[PDB]
Write an enzyme that holds these catalytic residues in place. Structure first.
Site, PDB file in Angstrom:
ATOM      1  N   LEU A  21       0.831  -1.202   0.000  1.00  0.00           N
ATOM      2  CA  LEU A  21       0.000   0.000   0.000  1.00  0.00           C
ATOM      3  C   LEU A  21       0.864   1.248   0.000  1.00  0.00           C
ATOM      4  CD1 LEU A  21      -2.969  -0.984   2.299  1.00  0.00           C
ATOM      5  CD2 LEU A  21      -2.961  -0.651  -0.177  1.00  0.00           C
ATOM      6  N   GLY A  22       2.130   1.101   0.392  1.00  0.00           N
ATOM      7  CA  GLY A  22       3.016   2.243   0.508  1.00  0.00           C
ATOM      8  C   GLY A  22       4.172   2.003   1.458  1.00  0.00           C
ATOM      9  N   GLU A  23       5.150   2.903   1.400  1.00  0.00           N
ATOM     10  CA  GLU A  23       6.374   2.806   2.230  1.00  0.00           C
ATOM     11  C   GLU A  23       6.567   4.100   3.008  1.00  0.00           C
ATOM     12  OE1 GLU A  23       9.730   1.279  -0.259  1.00  0.00           O
ATOM     13  OE2 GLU A  23       9.349  -0.343   1.122  1.00  0.00           O
ATOM     14  N   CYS A  25       8.845   6.185   6.491  1.00  0.00           N
ATOM     15  CA  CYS A  25      10.232   6.441   6.935  1.00  0.00           C
ATOM     16  C   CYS A  25      10.717   5.161   7.601  1.00  0.00           C
ATOM     17  CB  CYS A  25      10.276   7.612   7.873  1.00  0.00           C
ATOM     18  N   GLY A  27       9.280   1.227   7.848  1.00  0.00           N
ATOM     19  CA  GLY A  27       8.329   0.177   7.478  1.00  0.00           C
ATOM     20  C   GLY A  27       7.500   0.468   6.247  1.00  0.00           C
ATOM     21  N   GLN A  28       6.768  -0.554   5.842  1.00  0.00           N
ATOM     22  CA  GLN A  28       5.885  -0.495   4.706  1.00  0.00           C
ATOM     23  C   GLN A  28       4.498  -0.954   5.168  1.00  0.00           C
ATOM     24  OE1 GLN A  28       6.426  -3.821   1.924  1.00  0.00           O
ATOM     25  NE2 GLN A  28       8.179  -4.501   3.152  1.00  0.00           N
ATOM     26  N   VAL A  29       3.503  -0.717   4.330  1.00  0.00           N
ATOM     27  CA  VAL A  29       2.152  -1.163   4.648  1.00  0.00           C
ATOM     28  C   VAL A  29       1.662  -2.016   3.511  1.00  0.00           C
ATOM     29  CG1 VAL A  29      -0.082  -0.464   5.599  1.00  0.00           C
ATOM     30  CG2 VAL A  29       1.806   1.208   5.442  1.00  0.00           C
ATOM     31  N   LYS A  51       1.082  -3.252   8.838  1.00  0.00           N
ATOM     32  CA  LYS A  51       2.360  -2.533   8.965  1.00  0.00           C
ATOM     33  C   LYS A  51       3.491  -3.514   9.341  1.00  0.00           C
ATOM     34  CE  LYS A  51       0.277   1.792  10.051  1.00  0.00           C
ATOM     35  NZ  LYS A  51       0.632   3.110  10.538  1.00  0.00           N
ATOM     36  N   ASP A 160       2.379  15.499  12.128  1.00  0.00           N
ATOM     37  CA  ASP A 160       2.373  15.734  10.661  1.00  0.00           C
ATOM     38  C   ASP A 160       0.948  15.533  10.125  1.00  0.00           C
ATOM     39  OD1 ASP A 160       3.202  16.537   8.148  1.00  0.00           O
ATOM     40  OD2 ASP A 160       3.986  14.537   7.546  1.00  0.00           O
ATOM     41  N   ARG A 164      -2.766  13.934   3.277  1.00  0.00           N
ATOM     42  CA  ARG A 164      -2.123  12.651   2.899  1.00  0.00           C
ATOM     43  C   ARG A 164      -2.097  11.637   4.059  1.00  0.00           C
ATOM     44  NH1 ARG A 164       2.756   9.165   2.411  1.00  0.00           N
ATOM     45  NH2 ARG A 164       1.940   9.283   4.548  1.00  0.00           N
ATOM     46  N   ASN A 165      -2.194  12.106   5.291  1.00  0.00           N
ATOM     47  CA  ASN A 165      -2.225  11.264   6.506  1.00  0.00           C
ATOM     48  C   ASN A 165      -3.663  11.023   6.979  1.00  0.00           C
ATOM     49  OD1 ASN A 165       0.452  10.433   6.770  1.00  0.00           O
ATOM     50  ND2 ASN A 165       1.025  12.439   7.551  1.00  0.00           N
ATOM     51  N   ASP A 178      -1.265   7.055  11.031  1.00  0.00           N
ATOM     52  CA  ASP A 178       0.118   7.364  11.380  1.00  0.00           C
ATOM     53  C   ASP A 178       0.189   8.427  12.472  1.00  0.00           C
ATOM     54  OD1 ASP A 178       0.794   5.543   9.492  1.00  0.00           O
ATOM     55  OD2 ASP A 178       1.799   6.865   8.087  1.00  0.00           O
TER      56      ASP A 178
HETATM   57  C1  LIG Z   1      -7.983  -1.794   2.061  1.00  0.00           C
HETATM   58  O1  LIG Z   1      -9.182  -1.337   2.689  1.00  0.00           O
HETATM   59  C2  LIG Z   1      -7.585  -0.997   0.955  1.00  0.00           C
HETATM   60  N1  LIG Z   1      -6.746   0.033   1.108  1.00  0.00           N
HETATM   61  C3  LIG Z   1      -6.341   0.803   0.091  1.00  0.00           C
HETATM   62  C4  LIG Z   1      -5.534   1.895   0.052  1.00  0.00           C
HETATM   63  C5  LIG Z   1      -4.891   2.434   1.114  1.00  0.00           C
HETATM   64  O2  LIG Z   1      -4.095   3.396   1.005  1.00  0.00           O
HETATM   65  N2  LIG Z   1      -5.225   1.842   2.293  1.00  0.00           N
HETATM   66  C6  LIG Z   1      -4.620   2.092   3.469  1.00  0.00           C
HETATM   67  C7  LIG Z   1      -3.373   2.692   3.604  1.00  0.00           C
HETATM   68  C8  LIG Z   1      -2.814   2.825   4.880  1.00  0.00           C
HETATM   69  N3  LIG Z   1      -1.608   3.406   5.124  1.00  0.00           N
HETATM   70  C9  LIG Z   1      -0.727   3.827   4.028  1.00  0.00           C
HETATM   71  C10 LIG Z   1      -0.946   5.339   3.872  1.00  0.00           C
HETATM   72  O3  LIG Z   1      -0.707   5.924   5.147  1.00  0.00           O
HETATM   73  C11 LIG Z   1      -1.076   7.331   5.272  1.00  0.00           C
HETATM   74  C12 LIG Z   1      -3.496   2.341   6.002  1.00  0.00           C
HETATM   75  C13 LIG Z   1      -2.977   2.491   7.314  1.00  0.00           C
HETATM   76  N4  LIG Z   1      -2.581   2.608   8.343  1.00  0.00           N
HETATM   77  C14 LIG Z   1      -4.712   1.748   5.840  1.00  0.00           C
HETATM   78  N5  LIG Z   1      -5.235   1.624   4.571  1.00  0.00           N
HETATM   79  C15 LIG Z   1      -5.427   2.279  -1.218  1.00  0.00           C
HETATM   80  N6  LIG Z   1      -6.211   1.440  -1.956  1.00  0.00           N
HETATM   81  C16 LIG Z   1      -6.377   1.579  -3.429  1.00  0.00           C
HETATM   82  C17 LIG Z   1      -7.833   1.856  -3.825  1.00  0.00           C
HETATM   83  N7  LIG Z   1      -8.103   3.154  -4.480  1.00  0.00           N
HETATM   84  C18 LIG Z   1      -9.398   3.035  -5.182  1.00  0.00           C
HETATM   85  C19 LIG Z   1      -9.203   2.746  -6.664  1.00  0.00           C
HETATM   86  O4  LIG Z   1      -8.650   3.961  -7.276  1.00  0.00           O
HETATM   87  C20 LIG Z   1      -7.653   4.621  -6.411  1.00  0.00           C
HETATM   88  C21 LIG Z   1      -7.061   3.579  -5.432  1.00  0.00           C
HETATM   89  C22 LIG Z   1      -6.770   0.538  -1.150  1.00  0.00           C
HETATM   90  C23 LIG Z   1      -7.615  -0.486  -1.384  1.00  0.00           C
HETATM   91  C24 LIG Z   1      -8.039  -1.282  -0.320  1.00  0.00           C
HETATM   92 BR1  LIG Z   1      -9.285  -2.779  -0.604  1.00  0.00          BR
END
Ligand SMILES: *C(=O)c1nc2c(C(=O)Nc3cc(NCCOC)c(C#N)cn3)cn(CCN3CCOCC3)c2cc1Br
Length: 300
Positions: A21-23, A25, A27-29, A51, A160, A164-165, A178
């Site tokens: 889902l992302g990285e 500072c 860990g990653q998610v 996480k 922060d 975006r958070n 976060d």
């Molecule tokens: C699961 O419900 C799910 N999550 C999706 C995300 C997403 O960013 N989820 C997310 C991210 C984090 N943390 C990383 C960012 O931190 C600020 C957490 C935490 N903690 C929790 N959840 C993104 N997508 C992609 C879906 N969209 C819709 C389609 O077009 C644009 C992308 C997620 C999809 C799911 Br099923």
């Protein structure tokens, strides 16, 4: 390695890890499927976010993730935060399992939903009508404030707070993410630009930036910046202003202009959040009430 906490421990073989889902500072998610997160329904599937550390993790990296875990355990449950669901600490890598927010972060949520421009050919009855309406934007700000109010009542400072958070669920519920992070506040590269072009210094309260002082009132400053993000539908603050110029404009007491199509009520709240003196900014409790007044006035 870590001790077993039966309150929170979840069997890791009940997780199926999916797309990253992302990285951060540290860990990653990763997106994941969990089976039996509810012990009453052992075979029920749910989608969660996990996480974990990166492969190049240091002992500090692990310490920071463990610290985040322990903060989550203590914060409790709130509709408007990313809640802790379980942890995997035994016989394998550290996993901190939290709620997944299906629509991703609030900044991209808004930017993807900006209204059609005037270049669009009319096609049917609603070709002018974008997805975002004023009351939904106000409800987004209101929910973030309620979530921040809850975090403050638990003595948690975000440090922060930004669009975006904040993450968005399948039902458009705002959830602050976060919040429990070790953020290395004594070694911030103020000139740091992220992979997506963000300058995080543009969210810092003056007392944080100039004096390394953080309170709940410095999160209120960041909240006003986040209000500006919301009502520009995902815009970047201090448009066109590089960091060197941000420093002197802030020393001169400069504030962002009122943005287009933003009622004076909301710009007023922004400017209150950016009063120089932290005690002259509203509290999150006061922001919740003020935004509630607007939200009720416009939800007939
Ligand atoms: C699961 O419900 C799910 N999550 C999706 C995300 C997403 O960013 N989820 C997310 C991210 C984090 N943390 C990383 C960012 O931190 C600020 C957490 C935490 N903690 C929790 N959840 C993104 N997508 C992609 C879906 N969209 C819709 C389609 O077009 C644009 C992308 C997620 C999809 C799911 Br099923």
């Amino acid at each position: 390695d870590l001790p077993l906490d039966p309150l929170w421990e979840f069997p890791r073989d009940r997780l199926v890890l999916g797309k990253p889902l992302g990285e951060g500072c540290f860990g990653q998610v990763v997106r994941a499927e969990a089976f039996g997160m509810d012990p009453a329904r052992p075979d029920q599937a749910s989608t969660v976010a996990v996480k974990m550390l990166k492969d190049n993790a240091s002992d500090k990296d692990l310490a920071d993730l463990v610290s985040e875990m322990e903060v989550m355990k203590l914060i409790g449950r709130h509709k408007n935060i990313i809640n802790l669901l379980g942890v995997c600490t035994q016989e394998g890598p550290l996993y901190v399992i939290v709620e997944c927010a299906a629509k991703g972060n609030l900044r991209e949520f808004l930017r993807a939903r900006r209204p059609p421009g005037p270049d669009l050919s009319p096609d049917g009855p609603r070709s002018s009508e974008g997805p975002l309406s004023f009351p939904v934007l106000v409800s987004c700000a209101y929910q973030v404030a309620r979530g921040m109010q809850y975090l403050e009542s638990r003595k948690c400072i975000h440090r922060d707070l930004a669009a975006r958070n904040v993450l968005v669920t399948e039902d458009n519920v705002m959830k602050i993410a976060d919040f429990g992070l070790a953020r290395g506040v004594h070694h911030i590269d103020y000139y740091k630009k992220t992979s997506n072009g963000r300058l995080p210094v543009k969210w810092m309260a003056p007392e944080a930036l100039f004096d390394e002082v953080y309170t709940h009132q410095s999160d209120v400053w960041s909240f006003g910046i986040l209000l500006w993000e919301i009502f520009t539908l995902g815009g970047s603050p201090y448009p066109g202003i590089p960091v060197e110029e941000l420093f002197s404009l802030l020393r001169e007491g400069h504030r962002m202009d009122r943005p287009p199509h933003c009622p004076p009520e909301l710009y007023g709240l922004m400017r209150e959040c950016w009063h120089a003196a932290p005690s002259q900014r509203p509290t999150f409790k006061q922001l919740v009430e003020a935004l509630d007044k607007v939200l009720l006035a416009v939800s007939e």
